[PDB]
C-alpha cells in the first residue's frame, strides 16, 4: 500500500487526470511556495516573457528566499521566472506580479479569476508567494493536481520546471534548482517545486515520467516529502500500465453482425490502470439498428452510426464516435 507522511498528498495521471491515491485531498491547507506555480502559469501566458520589468521597492521588502533584486533594477520577465521557480524569489514573484498584473491586486484578481475558470474550488490567493501575510490564502492537495496539470500544458512551464540550472540573461546569476527530485535524487522527475513556511510546513508538487506514463504528485504538509514523492511514483511505475482498451480501427465485438468490417474508430483509446482495474473496464457500444433500407442504398448511412462508451465501474472513462466507412 502507499503510506506517506504527509497531512495531505495526491497522486494524478498526467494524462486523464485520474485521481490514483489521495489523502485528504480535498483539506484546505497553508501552502507556502508552491502558490508560485500560479505565478509562472499567468507570467508564461501574458505574452510579456521577453519585457524588461522595473523592479519596486516593494518587490525588493519582501520577507524569505530572494534572488536578490535591487529597486530599479531592469530585468527581463522571463529571468524573473526562472528565479521564481528555481530559487522560489519571493522579490521575483512581487515583481513579476507587479508587471504582469499592475498591482499586488490586479495579479491577485487573475490568479483568482485563473483559478475559477480550472475549478480549483477549495482555492483562494491573496499573493503570488505564498508567505503567510494574509488569512485565506490556501488550497489543496487535489486542487493543486489541478493547477499542475495545466501547467504542465504550457511547454514554456514545462521547460522551465524541468531545468537543473539557469544562466539569467540580463541578471548576473547562475541559479540551480532547489528540486532535489530533479537534481540528484530521482531520475524520472521532470520537475516541481518545493514550499516551506513555518506555518505550512512542506510542501511539494513534482512531476515523473516513465515509459511515456507522466504523473504528478502533491504533498501538503510532509516532513519526508521528498521520499515520499519517489515512493509514490515507484508504486504508480510498478502497478499500473498504459492498456490498449480499444484499437483504432475495426471493432472486435461487432463480429458477426452488420457493422463487422465497415464500422470503425479513428483512434486507440489507451489508459493507466492496475491490473485489477483493468478488469473491471466494460467497452459499450450503442449503435443505430441497421435498416433494409441500408442494404440496397449506402447513402442512407450516416458518417457516425453510434458511439463507443468505456466505463469504469460507474465512470465514463472514454466516449468516442464510432465511424461507417464511406
Same mark, same amino acid.
Given at each position: #500500500? ?7 498528498? +495526491? ?6 487526470? !485520474? ?10 491547507? !497553508? ?7 500560479? %505565478? ?46 528555481? !530559487? ?33 474550488? $477549495?482555492? !483562494? ?8 501575510? =494574509?488569512?485565506? =490564502? ?9 493547477? %499542475? ?13 524541468? %531545468?537543473?540550472? @539557469? ?11 532547489? $528540486? ?62 498504459? @492498456? ?24 486507440? +483509446? ?44 460507474? #465512470? ?11
Amino acid at each position: #500500500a502507499i503510506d506517506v507522511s504527509a497531512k495531505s498528498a +495526491i497522486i494524478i495521471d498526467g494524462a486523464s487526470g !485520474r485521481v490514483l491515491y489521495a489523502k485528504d485531498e480535498h483539506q484546505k491547507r !497553508r501552502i507556502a511556495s508552491i502558490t508560485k506555480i500560479m %505565478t509562472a502559469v499567468l507570467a508564461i501566458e501574458s505574452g510579456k516573457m521577453d519585457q524588461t520589468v522595473t523592479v519596486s521597492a516593494n518587490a525588493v521588502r519582501t520577507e524569505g528566499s530572494a534572488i536578490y533584486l535591487t529597486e530599479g533594477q531592469k530585468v527581463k520577465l522571463k529571468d524573473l521566472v526562472y528565479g521564481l521557480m528555481l !530559487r522560489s524569489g519571493n522579490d521575483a514573484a512581487v515583481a513579476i506580479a507587479e508587471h504582469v498584473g499592475g498591482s499586488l491586486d490586479g495579479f491577485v484578481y487573475m490568479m483568482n479569476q485563473k483559478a475559477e475558470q480550472l475549478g480549483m474550488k $477549495n482555492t !483562494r490567493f491573496q499573493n503570488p508567494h505564498g508567505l503567510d501575510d =494574509h488569512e485565506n =490564502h490556501y488550497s489543496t492537495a487535489y486542487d493543486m493536481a489541478i493547477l %499542475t496539470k495545466y501547467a504542465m500544458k504550457l511547454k514554456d512551464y514545462q521547460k522551465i520546471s524541468g %531545468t537543473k540550472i @539557469y544562466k539569467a540573461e540580463t541578471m548576473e546569476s547562475v541559479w540551480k534548482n532547489k $528540486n532535489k527530485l530533479l537534481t540528484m535524487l530521482y531520475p524520472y522527475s521532470t520537475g516541481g517545486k518545493t514550499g516551506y513556511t513555518k506555518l505550512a510546513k512542506r510542501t511539494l508538487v513534482s512531476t515523473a515520467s516513465k515509459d511515456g506514463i507522466d504523473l504528478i504528485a502533491v504533498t501538503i504538509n510532509d516532513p519526508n516529502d521528498w521520499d515520499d514523492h519517489m515512493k509514490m511514483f515507484n508504486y504508480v511505475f510498478e502497478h499500473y500500465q498504459t @492498456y490498449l482498451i480499444a484499437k483504432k480501427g475495426d471493432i472486435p465485438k461487432l463480429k458477426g453482425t452488420f457493422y463487422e468490417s465497415k464500422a470503425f474508430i479513428k483512434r486507440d +483509446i489507451t489508459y493507466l490502470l492496475t491490473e485489477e482495474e483493468k478488469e473491471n473496464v466494460k467497452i459499450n457500444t450503442t449503435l443505430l439498428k441497421p435498416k433494409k433500407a441500408w442494404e440496397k442504398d449506402a447513402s442512407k448511412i450516416p458518417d457516425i452510426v453510434g458511439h463507443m462508451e468505456i466505463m469504469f465501474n460507474d #465512470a465514463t472513462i472514454a466516449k468516442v464516435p464510432i465511424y461507417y466507412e464511406n
